[PDB]
């Protein structure tokens, strides 16, 4: 019948993984005990987005809204526009699409509208340089997120266009058992509807922390000014640690609220990126969910990915248990032979997924 889950925990994946598998799923007891039970608008909006890029899928939400039945269709894609409710930014909706877009009948050219940043979801600049670079490593050669308008909270007004040109049968098998050597650190300091002095001060705060390092530091000042600057003033920084040896990235990102010091947050994110590096072996934590699934959906082949002990956390474990429930795939783990670090190798057999929706 239907594999059953509980709660809103990992709502997007259980649908995304369901969509890729073709296996029907039931999500039940969604916030049953809360005063406002059931699905939230942004989650409902995500369901509308899933229907738009697919055909033949049946989505049934209970009368109380606490249970949803999802029978997946085929990924079809196409050109469309999606209005994102204010409760979540665009990155909330762009992220799941990255998981499905490269395996589509037609090209994904989806136009997103709403707030473009938040304290808890992926930013524009994170996706462009923090998640997407992983996709090229997995064989998604061409994928772009064009920034037509930035929208800061609370009024938003931003505009981002998601285009993936690479359509592939399945991602290449993953083989990385080493600790990447970071060559340089880059980033974009952006602000909307404000004075460019704020942008410079943040790079100053970021540079203050990171000047101790022996590698080059170059942070772009992307001040957005004019009609494309959104309807609210806002600002943020994302700093990316880059490895040109085999094309890898580690990144951190935060945005600022009213009354905060641009130098303070610039110091925070620059300090923040180092913690992500410290917890990273081959990938930072915030792209573990993206990389692991691609290994799972590879050919009938064992991929290898080096992970740190700091990365194997509750989020990692719940993610794995979700994968097994739906694919029956188990991520085996063997220790590294080195003693300098306690890094860890994740080995995954692919389920032999293929893009059967594309035309030959």
């Amino acid at each position: 019948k239907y594999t059953t889950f509980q709660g809103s925990q990992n709502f997007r994946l259980r649908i995304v993984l369901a969509t890729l598998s073709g296996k029907p799923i039931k999500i039940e007891k969604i916030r049953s005990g809360d005063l406002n039970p059931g699905l939230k608008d942004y989650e409902v909006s995500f369901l509308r987005l899933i229907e738009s890029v697919t055909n033949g899928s049946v989505i049934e939400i209970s009368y109380t809204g606490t249970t949803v039945i999802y029978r997946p269709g085929i990924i079809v894609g196409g050109a469309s526009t999606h209005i994102c409710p204010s409760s979540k930014p665009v990155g909330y909706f762009v992220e799941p699409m990255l998981y499905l877009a490269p395996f589509s009948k037609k090209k994904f050219s989806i136009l997103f509208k709403g707030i473009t940043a938040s304290h808890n979801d992926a930013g524009i600049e994170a996706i462009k340089w923090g998640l997407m670079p992983v996709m090229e490593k997995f064989g998604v050669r061409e994928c772009a997120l064009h920034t037509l308008k930035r929208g800061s909270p609370p009024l938003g007004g931003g505009e981002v266009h998601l285009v993936v040109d690479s359509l592939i049968a399945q991602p290449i098998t993953m083989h990385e058992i080493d600790r990447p050597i970071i060559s340089s650190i880059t980033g974009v300091a952006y602000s909307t509807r404000v004075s460019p002095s704020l942008v410079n001060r943040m790079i100053d705060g970021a540079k203050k922390v990171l000047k101790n390092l022996q590698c080059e530091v170059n942070i772009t000042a992307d001040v957005w000014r004019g009609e494309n600057s959104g309807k609210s003033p806002g600002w943020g920084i994302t700093l990316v640690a880059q490895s040109k040896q085999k094309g890898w990235s580690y990144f951190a990102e935060d945005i600022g609220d009213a009354g905060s010091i641009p130098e303070e947050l610039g110091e925070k994110v620059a300090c923040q990126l180092l913690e992500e590096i410290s917890k990273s072996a081959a990938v930072g934590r915030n792209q573990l969910p993206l990389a692991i699934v691609y290994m799972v959906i590879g050919k009938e082949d064992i991929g290898r990915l080096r992970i740190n002990k700091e990365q194997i956390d509750e989020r990692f474990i719940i993610l794995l248990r979700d994968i097994k429930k739906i694919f029956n795939t188990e991520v085996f783990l063997k220790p590294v032979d080195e003693a300098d670090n306690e890094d860890m190798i994740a080995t995954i057999k692919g389920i032999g997924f293929t893009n059967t929706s594309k035309k030959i």
């Binding site: 059931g38 409902v44 055909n55 033949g56 899928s57 049934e60 939400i61 209970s62 009368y63």
Partner: peptide, 10 residues
């Protein structure tokens, strides 16, 4: 078009 978000929510 096929499929749909058949919203039976109150």
């Amino acid at each position: 078009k096929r499929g749909g978000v058949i919203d039976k929510r109150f």
